[PDB]
């Protein structure tokens, strides 16, 4: 969230953070900002990306 | 001033290096998409190269190595 | 694999910290743990922190511990005890902590299984950030003294408290 | 630029006064000419004065404490709540100091450093009240805690006082480590330490099935540290 | 797998500190050493997260936590020294007079 | 024929490239600023590449020997300008920046 | 309250961060190439 | 508010005996670690471990007995009588407390106290 | 300890960490089944909530 | 880049081997002084001072006047502590 | 260093100068500011003298108390004057002087 990157440029996930914060700054229900929030958290941890790639690896191991 | 000379030199040749890298990555990504289409053939509900980000904005593929750039 | 080696060294050295009968030996093993930690930090690309862990943890803190423990001349009878009767209580507490706390990141940070395919070609290089790279040192120094200077100064206050307390509690002027 | 620091006038004053008293005490306590006078009561009166002036500066400058809030935002947050909390803290410190003079002169506790450590811990608690980030909160808590460790052991030839200090330092350090672990888990799970960012991330989800075990255990460890601090059972037996 | 491996390293250090508290009932110096081990593990947690998240906040706080660890060890060892000086021994049976 | 566009060749020619391919460079950088997706920038990249390779071939045609010496020294010293001043001056005297 | 995080006191970063958006250490790398 | 189960009174009693042996083993472990070792056992390791394990087993046994008899009598009361209330379970709490804790305490006074206590708890449930 | 004792403890620890690696691979491979179980239980809970709200 | 640290590791291994060879070839043919604790404490404090000096020294060109004066305030606090130690006799070994 | 004087709670009185310079604030000191300043300093000197008698350092104690009082009183007067110029405190005199010069 801070924006200070470890190599002296804008942090990797800072634009996602700022989109989420700007959404929540005027949407009275946080459920309206769910998509931007999960985009921010996906940028931090890559959970869904790695899960999908592991599904691909799983199917490869099944068909071999 | 010496450092600025080197740094300006890096700035003028940046676009051609980036364009080469972009072409390389696009070709590799097409090959990987064909690979995924083959492997996930006969897996119902799949979508080849689906963007996991809702915003759809482009991000480089995550690598699963904490600090690959320093080694 | 390399992280397996360093983690194994850290595990054994830490067990030696907590289980060596002689406290001087405990301080020396503690120093081995900090060396291994510095190795991990070098793997992360944080060379400033890797060096500072040597300078401060080993060069200053461990030296303080060693000076104090060596002049104490502790006899083993004063601190000896059998630990065989703790194996169960350490087993539950360790297991519960093990089952919960080694795997806490697994649901949030799912690992990428390494496949029989060269994913290295999918690494995208942005040369723009490489024209003028910043060291760990200068990235940290860009922030400590301007945008977060209050925390810096509060840390100075903490050190001042340490100095005053050290004098008031132990000083016997000749 | 100077006017930005109106938000921290109370703290600047008390810190500077504490430094002045430290120098005064050490210069004249070591004086052969004055025959090494005890300065605990003299420094105590001057420090009571300093606390009261700090209270005046803070109470009379209620709006000014919120000046330049964007510039100070990543360091602390001053509002109505922190205003009254800090006033009550200063009033309590002044009363506690006023109760100490008979102890200073009749026991002959001559250490003026006692007053300085009390004042520095008051500085720490002032910064605790206005903390709006896990890092700032931890630093202020640690400053406060280290001052208490030292003053708990002030009767350094007493078995009781040395025992108190030893138990306090060990159990305090343990609890602080637990709290810091919780803070690290929360940062790792959310990428944030500022209280506003944490509020935005955590609101609307609590435990929506897909709960961040990292966030849940960071909260738990931080709560354990807090409960130790308020002497709540089962983290009480130090008290 | 990098991030899980870096985290379990720091985690074993933290668990070792906990075990050192549990196994050292007659040795309070090692108890202090175990507390430092826990503090080191937390510091490592901040540095790893800083890299993983590409964020500098973990690094600033790590430096400040090192300052706190230093002050903590200094004051703790002073208190150890004065306790030893009063009693002539570090055995736990001579620091149990406050009770009830 | 066409020189291999290695790091040495590009670094040695960087001043000429900046003076000659400035519009293509700026256009590419603007498009990259708007969109980091490599696929959505290939055209500006082709414009940049064509400009640079044309200038490279031109400079090779004009001053072959001086270019060869400057490129060789630049490769020998890993593109350190200070250790290559003499041949830089010889290269710029025969192939002016303009 | 309903949407407390909407209250201006809680949107401090949304107003501060744009003021430091050109500060070295948090810029997009392409800003230096075009400026 | 309670429709997440599959029940089975025999399964209830068996699982209660297992949870009670779970909880008694942990409780005995904690009790054994809290206490000091006898002075004549400071230089020898094995008997301390043996005593800790014996305390673990004894407390697991007694807590399993309470945790089994409680649910067993509770279900054996709401099956023959065929009613659901806090009265069924208060009888079970009383019999479990009385029987087990008076066998261990070897005192009729204490059994009636333990049974009374265990009922008020199940009743407050 | 003996130097050889320290080396052997290090070897045992290395084996432990490789086993931990296998455990992490196992946990990763079962993400999909855990998600499926979570989804089925969520559907059951939602159906129960909707049905009980009907009254 | 961390590439340059690898020669250091190989250098350490070789230096260790030289040490073992040199040391192993001949096998073929209760008075606690508080002042040491005090000097350790002082070294710890000024060790952290140097630690905090390093990033500041490399960052002076970017932090400008604000960073300079913030470090000056840090040093002022630590130097007040040093004056306290000096007056109390912590720096006298007689 | 980017700066922003903007306060959370807006000024309730006319803003004569949003971010007044140090010397302007000092030159804005009124008679009441000087009264506050002098009172705080005098009380501090008195406390220094009285608390210094028993140790035997009443003079140096007066000096120390006076330094504390001088710094505190100046900070308080500056607080009041700057708050008046910024519109956070009642500032009839500042508004009157502003509408004329
Ligand atoms: C094919 C190649 C062949 C050629 C090469 C062969 C090379 C030789 C073999 C390598 C060396 C092995 C032999 C070691 C020396 C033995 C000779 C000797 O004289 O020893 C005297 C020794 C006397 O002790 P001492 O050194 O004189 O010190 C006396 C005082 O203690 C000194 O006082 P102190 O203050 O310094 O220390 C205090 C305290 C220090 O307290 C302690 O150190 C604690 C002792 C218990 C250690 C508990 C485990 C620690 C290791 C970590 C393992 C993972 C832990 C994970 C826990 C966290 C998870 C939540 O002292 C002690 O308690 C000493 C106890 C030593 C016992 C060590 C037992 C280690 C556990 C082995 C478990 C084996 C399981 C295998 C699978 C493991 C699961 C993966 O007695 C012994 O014989 C014990 C050592 C023999 C067993 C240890 C070595 C095990 C290695 C197994 C082989 C590796 C298998 C895995 C391979 C993986 C391949 C992929
Ligand atoms: C590509 C890589 C190629 C590598 C090739 C090399 C591979 C070597 C494999 C060796 C394993 C097989 C050994 C076969 C048997 C050998 C025959 C034999 O044992 O006779 C030897 C014989 C003693 O053997 P022993 O019969 O077993 O007696 C043991 C005790 O007496 C028993 O008495 P105790 O029961 O009362 O125990 C008291 C305690 C004494 O109390 C202690 O605390 C022990 C000292 C530990 C801490 C001391 C260092 C911290 C103090 C500060 C030092 C300065 C710090 C800064 C400078 C260094 C930092 C770079 O003794 C011990 O616990 C000894 C345990 C040793 C643990 C420490 C060594 C491991 C360090 C990590 C090595 C990493 C690489 C190897 C692993 C690679 C992955 C598997 O005499 C000698 O060892 C000669 C003395 C010269 C030793 C020099 C070693 C280096 C010292 C300077 C460096 C200090 C830092 C260490 C490196 C740090 C790296 C960053
Ligand atoms: C002053 C006093 C004295 C004492 C002291 O200070 C104090 O003295 C100080 C001196 C210190 C030592 C100094 C130096 C080191 C070396 C370091 O060790 C480097 C290890 C790193 C670098 O290793 C490679 O790095 C590059 C590859 O990465 C290589 O580049 C190639 O590859 C490029 C790309 O194609 C090409 O472009 C290039 O052209 C091509 O050359 C490069 O050559 C090579 O070096 C990290 O590497 C690993 O990391 C990987 C990621 O985790 C792991 O990947 C694995 O996991 C993945 C999934 O996660 C899977 O996908 C993978 O399949 C699967 O393999 C894998 O384990 C392994 O690669 C370990 C620490 C240590 C010992 C320090 C210890 C502490 C001290 C003794 C201090 C001590 C305290
Ligand atoms: C390690 C110490 C754990 C308890 C030791 C008892 C012997 C082992 C039995 C065991 O594994 O624990 C059982 C009982 O242990 C407990 O759960 C303890 C009871 C807790 C009740 C505490 C009451 C007061 C609070 C649970 O049995 P299970 O593993 O078949 O259950 C499967 C379940 O889905 C997940 O494990
Ligand atoms: C051993 C040496 C001891 C030295 C002791 C003397 C100096 C101690 C520090 C005193 C504070 C500053 C005194 C110097 C006055 C000159 C200040 C000045 O010149 O103004 C500059 C601004 O100076 C400052 O504002 C820095 C003030 C330093 C902070 C001192 C702390 C005061 C209170 C802080 C409150 C926080 C709570 C304290 C926690 C313990 C102008 O800079 P700029 O606005 O043009 O641009 C900023 C910069 O160039 C780019 O980054
Ligand atoms: C409200 C606080 C105002 C400032 C407080 C001054 C701080 C130091 C004064 C402490 C009182 C003091 O000095 O005690 C001495 C003397 O006490 C005093 O005389 C009072 C000193 C000054 C306090 C009152 C004077 C006027 C204060 C007005 C406000 C200023 C010592 O007493 P003794 O040993 O002589 O007792 C013998 C006699 O039998 C007592 O009954
Ligand atoms: C613990 C921290 C230790 C360091 C000490 C911090 C406070 C002392 C600062 C002294 C310098 C102040 C200064 O020059 O400002 C005027 C000065 C005006 O210069 P003039 O116009 O030439 O008078 O202000 C500025 O323009 C510079 C601003 C510097 C930042 C000030 C931060 C501290 C504010 C608290 C001041 C408290 C009252 C003292 C004010 C009168 C001093 C003469
Ligand atoms: C605030 C920013 C920096 C903070 C840190 C540094 C602060 C400065 C150091 C303060 C330490 C205390 C200094 C004490 C000086 C005492 C001098 C002395 O010996 O005086 C005796 C000396 C001679 O008198 P004797 O003790 O009777 O011989 O001076 C006096 O006693 C003068 C008394 C009249 C003063 C009244 C007016 C005071 C107004 C405030 C000034």
Curated annotation (Swiss-Prot), chain B:
Subcellular location, record wording: Mitochondrion inner membrane
Disulfide bonds: none
Recorded coiled-coil stretches: none
Family membership: Belongs to the complex I NDUFA13 subunit family.
Function: Accessory subunit of the mitochondrial membrane respiratory chain NADH dehydrogenase (Complex I), that is believed not to be involved in catalysis. Complex I functions in the transfer of electrons from NADH to the respiratory chain. The immediate electron acceptor for the enzyme is believed to be ubiquinone.
Subunit structure: Complex I is composed of at least 49 different subunits.
Protein name: NADH dehydrogenase [ubiquinone] 1 alpha subcomplex subunit 13-A
Parent-record interval covered: 73 to 143 of 143
Curated annotation (Swiss-Prot), chain C:
Compartments (UniProt record): Mitochondrion membrane
Reaction equation(s) it catalyzes: a ubiquinone + NADH + 5 H(+)(in) = a ubiquinol + NAD(+) + 4 H(+)(out)
Chief place where the protein resides: mitochondrion
Keyword Methyltransferase: no
Bilayer-crossing regions: 48-68, 86-106, 150-170
Gene Ontology CC entries for this record: mitochondrial membrane
Keywords carried by this UniProt record: Electron transport, Membrane, Mitochondrion, NAD, Respiratory chain, Translocase, Transmembrane, Transmembrane helix, Transport, Ubiquinone
MF annotations from Gene Ontology: NADH dehydrogenase (ubiquinone) activity
First-tier enzyme category under EC: translocase
The enzyme's E.C. designation: 7.1.1.2
Coiled coil feature spans: none
Domain of life: Eukaryota
Protein topology in the membrane: Multi-pass membrane protein
Physiological role: Core subunit of the mitochondrial membrane respiratory chain NADH dehydrogenase (Complex I) that is believed to belong to the minimal assembly required for catalysis. Complex I functions in the transfer of electrons from NADH to the respiratory chain. The immediate electron acceptor for the enzyme is believed to be ubiquinone.
Quaternary structure and partners: Complex I is composed of at least 49 different subunits.
Family as reported in the entry's similarity comment: Belongs to the complex I subunit 6 family.
Note: A stretch of 270 kb of the mitochondrial genome is duplicated within the centromere of chromosome 2 resulting in the duplication of the gene. The expression of the duplicated gene (At2g07731) is not demonstrated. It is also probably not RNA edited and therefore differs in all the positions known to be edited.
Protein name per UniProt: NADH-ubiquinone oxidoreductase chain 6
Organism in which the protein naturally occurs: Arabidopsis thaliana (Mouse-ear cress)
Gene that produces this protein: ND6
Shown part of the complete sequence: 1 to 174 of 205
UniProtKB/Swiss-Prot annotation, chain F:
Residue positions of motif Cx9C motif 1: 21-31
GO cellular component: mitochondrial intermembrane space; mitochondrion; plastid
Motif (Cx9C motif 2): 41-51
Main localization, broad class: mitochondrion
Domain annotation CHCH: ranges: 18-59, 60-98
Keyword terms, alphabetized: Acetylation, Disulfide bond, Electron transport, Mitochondrion, Repeat, Respiratory chain, Transport
Keyword flag Acyltransferase: no
Residue ranges of the motif Cx9C motif 3: 63-73
GO biological process: mitochondrial electron transport, NADH to ubiquinone
Disulfide bonds: 21-51, 31-41, 63-95, 73-84
Pfam families, per database record: CHCH
Motif (Cx10C motif): 84-95
UniProt subcellular location: Mitochondrion; Mitochondrion intermembrane space
PANTHER family with a match to the protein in the record: NADH DEHYDROGENASE [UBIQUINONE] 1 ALPHA SUBCOMPLEX SUBUNIT 8, NADH-UBIQUINONE OXIDOREDUCTASE
Known role: Accessory subunit of the mitochondrial membrane respiratory chain NADH dehydrogenase (Complex I), that is believed not to be involved in catalysis. Complex I functions in the transfer of electrons from NADH to the respiratory chain. The immediate electron acceptor for the enzyme is believed to be ubiquinone.
Family according to the record: Belongs to the complex I NDUFA8 subunit family.
Subunit structure, interactors included: Complex I is composed of at least 49 different subunits.
Domain notes: Contains four C-X9-C motifs that are predicted to form a helix-coil-helix structure, permitting the formation of intramolecular disulfide bonds.
Protein name in UniProt: NADH dehydrogenase [ubiquinone] 1 alpha subcomplex subunit 8-B
Gene source species: Arabidopsis thaliana
Curated annotation (Swiss-Prot), chain J:
Coiled-coil boundaries: none
Subcellular localization, as worded in the UniProt entry: Mitochondrion membrane
Membrane topology: Multi-pass membrane protein
Stored Pfam families: Oxidored_q4
Catalytic activities: a ubiquinone + NADH + 5 H(+)(in) = a ubiquinol + NAD(+) + 4 H(+)(out)
InterPro entries (UniProt xref): NAD(P)H_OxRDtase_bac/plastid, NADH_UbQ/plastoQ_OxRdtase_su3, NDAH_ubi_oxred_su3_sf
Molecular-function GO terms, alphabetical: NADH dehydrogenase (ubiquinone) activity
Top-level taxon of the source organism: Eukaryota
PANTHER family in the cross-refs: NADH-UBIQUINONE OXIDOREDUCTASE CHAIN 3 (PTHR11058:SF9)
Quaternary structure annotation from Swiss-Prot or TrEMBL: Complex I is composed of at least 49 different subunits.
Miscellaneous comment text of the record: A stretch of 270 kb of the mitochondrial genome is duplicated within the centromere of chromosome 2 resulting in the duplication of the gene. The expression of this duplicated gene (At2g07751) is not demonstrated. It is also probably not RNA edited and therefore differs in all the positions known to be edited.
Protein name as annotated: NADH-ubiquinone oxidoreductase chain 3
Organism: Arabidopsis thaliana (Mouse-ear cress)
Lineage: Eukaryota, Viridiplantae, Streptophyta, Embryophyta, Tracheophyta
